[PDB]
Ligand binder design. Structure first.
Ligand SMILES: C[C@@H]1O[C@@H](O[C@H]2[C@H](O)[C@@H](CO)NC[C@@H]2O)[C@H](O)[C@H](O[C@@H]2O[C@H](CO)[C@@H](O)[C@H](O[C@@H]3O[C@H](CO)[C@@H](O)[C@H](O)[C@@H]3O[C@H]3O[C@H](CO)[C@@H](O)[C@H](O)[C@@H]3O)[C@@H]2O)[C@H]1O
Ligand SMILES: [Cl-]
Ligand SMILES: [Cl-]
Ligand SMILES: [Cl-]
Length: 412
C-alpha cells in the first residue's frame, strides 16, 4: 500500500514552518540564544503560550514586565508571533472551591476573558496573530466536560473584542487536541460547525499528535487520510486558513506516559518523516512542538520535545532538520516522484522541485529494501539523520536503498 503525496501549492519554509516556544520560562540571554538557533534554520514564526492566572494574579492586578520585554525582543529579532491565552484567572474561574485545577475551568463570563485579549492586542501591536484558549476538547484545558456551546461563546466574544482593536489582525481559534475528537464521541470541529462558528472567520487549527509519524499503529498508517478528510471539511466550511499549531515527539527516557519511548534518535527520525507528510498536505502553516527542552516545571514527557537542549544547543532532531532544509533550499514547488520499479509495499513517496530546478524525492518504507529508478543515470542520495551523501550512477537505471527513515534523492 504505497502512499504518494503531492502538495497543493509551493512551500516557503520561512512562511510555512514555525516552532512553538516557551520563552517566558527562560532568561532573555537564554531565549535570545534559542532565537539564534531558530534563525539559523531560516525560520521566523513562533507560537507562545500565555496563562491568564499567571498574567493577572488578582482582579485587575497584572504581572506584565517579562512579557513586555519578550514582545520587545521578538520585534527586535524580527520574528512573527502568535500568542494564545488559556486558563481562567482565579477571580473568574468556574472551578469549584475544592478543585486542585483552578485554571483548567472556563471563565464564568466570556466577555471578561475577551477584554483581556483586547488589552493584550492593544498593548502588543507587533504580535502577528492572537489565539483563543487551547485544546478545549481535552479535559485538562476545559473542565469538567467539553462544551462546544461554551467554547463558541468564548471564541465569539474574543473575536469581536480583538477586531475592535485591530479589524485586520487574524483571530485564531484554539488548537484542538488530536483531530478535535471529544470524549463524548463528537468532534469539536463538527459540533462548532453545527453552531455556525465558521461565520466568525477564525483560523482553524488542530494538534494531530500520533504515536508514529504516519498514524498510531503500524497496521493502520492513516495520518494522511485522516488529515486530508479534516482539512477538506474545514475548506468546505469556508475557514480563512488551516494551521496545525502543535505536533511532534518527546525524546524522554520515561516512564512511558502516552507516548512510546523513542529517544533523541527516534525524535529526529519521526519529526522528519512527519514534516515530509505535513508539508505536502493542505495546511497554510504548521508549528513543531517545540523549540526547547524544558526544566522540571514541565511534566516528565513535556521536558524533552525540544529541537534544542536546555543549553540552547542542537539535539539530533535539530541537526537532522538543518540538513533536511539545506538539501531542500528555502522553497519547494509540487512535483512528481521519479518513475520507480519495485518500490516496496508501505512506501511513502513525495516529489518536489527546488529553487535550482532540481527534483527532490522524499521516501521511506517500514520494510526497507531497494527500489529501481529505470529512467535515471545520475542522482545524489542524502540521509538527513546521519549526514551521509551518496552519488549514485548507472548505465541503465539506478538502484536506491530504501530505509524506514526518510531519505532525500536529488535528481535532474
Ligand atoms: C508549553 C506547554 O504547552 C501546553 O501544553 C501542551 C503540551 O505540552 C503538549 C505535549 O504534552 N500537548 C499539547 C498541549 O497544548 C500548555 O500551555 C502547558 O501549560 C499548561 O496550561 C494549563 C492551562 O493554563 C495549566 O493548567 C497547566 O498548569 C499545570 O497543571 C498541572 C496539573 O495539570 C500542574 O502539575 C503544573 O504544575 C501546572 O500547574 C501550575 O500552573 C497552573 C497554570 O498557571 C496553575 O494554575 C497551578 O496552580 C500551578 O501553579 C500548564 O500551565 C504548557 O506548559
Ligand atoms: Cl512563553
Ligand atoms: Cl503566562
Ligand atoms: Cl524518472
Amino acid at each position: 500500500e504505497i502512499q504518494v503525496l503531492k502538495a497543493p501549492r509551493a512551500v516557503v519554509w520561512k512562511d510555512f514552518l514555525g516552532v512553538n516556544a516557551q520563552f517566558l520560562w527562560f532568561s532573555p540571554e537564554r531565549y535570545n540564544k534559542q532565537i539564534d538557533r531558530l534563525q539559523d534554520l531560516g525560520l521566523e514564526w513562533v507560537r507562545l503560550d500565555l496563562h491568564w492566572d499567571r498574567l493577572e494574579t488578582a482582579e485587575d492586578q497584572y504581572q506584565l514586565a517579562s512579557l513586555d520585554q519578550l514582545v520587545k525582543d521578538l520585534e527586535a529579532r524580527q520574528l512573527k508571533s502568535v500568542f494564545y491565552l488559556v486558563g481562567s484567572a482565579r477571580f473568574i474561574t468556574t472551578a469549584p472551591f475544592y478543585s486542585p485545577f483552578q485554571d483548567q475551568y472556563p471563565p464564568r463570563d466570556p466577555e471578561v476573558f475577551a477584554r483581556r485579549m483586547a488589552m493584550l492586542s492593544q498593548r502588543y501591536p507587533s504580535v502577528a496573530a492572537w489565539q483563543v484558549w487551547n485544546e478545549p476538547n481535552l479535559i485538562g484545558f476545559w473542565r469538567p466536560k467539553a462544551d462546544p456551546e461554551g467554547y463558541a461563546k468564548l471564541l465569539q466574544a474574543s473575536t469581536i473584542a480583538l477586531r475592535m482593536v485591530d479589524p485586520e489582525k487574524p483571530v485564531v481559534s484554539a488548537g484542538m487536541a488530536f483531530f478535535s475528537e471529544m470524549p463524548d464521541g463528537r468532534t469539536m470541529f463538527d459540533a462548532l460547525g453545527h453552531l455556525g462558528v465558521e461565520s466568525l472567520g477564525t483560523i482553524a487549527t488542530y494538534h494531530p499528535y500520533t504515536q508514529l509519524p504516519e498514524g498510531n499503529y503500524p497496521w493502520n498508517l492513516d495520518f494522511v487520510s485522516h488529515a486530508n478528510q479534516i482539512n477538506r471539511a474545514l475548506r468546505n466550511a469556508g475557514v480563512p486558513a488551516i494551521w496545525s499549531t502543535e505536533w511532534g515527539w518527546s525524546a524522554y527516557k520515561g516512564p512511558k506516559e502516552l507516548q512510546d519511548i523513542i529517544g533523541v534518535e527516534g525524535q529526529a527520525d519521526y519529526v522528519l518523516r512527519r514534516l515530509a507528510l505535513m508539508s505536502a498536505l493542505d495546511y497554510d502553516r504548521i508549528f513543531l512542538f517545540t523549540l526547547s527542552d524544558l526544566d522540571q516545571r514541565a511534566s516528565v514527557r513535556d521536558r524533552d520535545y525540544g529541537l534544542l537542549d536546555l543549553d540552547a544547543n542542537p539535539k539530533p532532531v535539530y541537526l537532522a532538520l538543518q540538513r533536511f532544509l539545506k538539501v531542500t533550499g528555502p522553497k519547494l514547488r509540487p512535483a512528481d516522484p521519479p518513475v520507480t520499479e519495485d518500490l516496496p509495499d508501505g512506501s511513502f513517496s513525495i516529489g518536489w522541485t527546488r529553487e535550482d530546478g532540481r527534483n527532490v524525492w522524499l521516501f521511506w518504507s517500514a520494510r526497507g529494501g531497494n527500489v529501481r529508478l529505470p529512467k535515471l543515470k545520475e542522482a545524489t542520495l542524502h540521509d538527513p539523520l546521519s549526514g551521509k551523501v551518496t552519488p549514485l550512477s548507472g548505465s541503465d537505471g539506478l538502484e536506491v536503498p530504501v530505509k524506514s527513515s526518510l531519505q532525500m534523492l536529488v535528481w535532474e
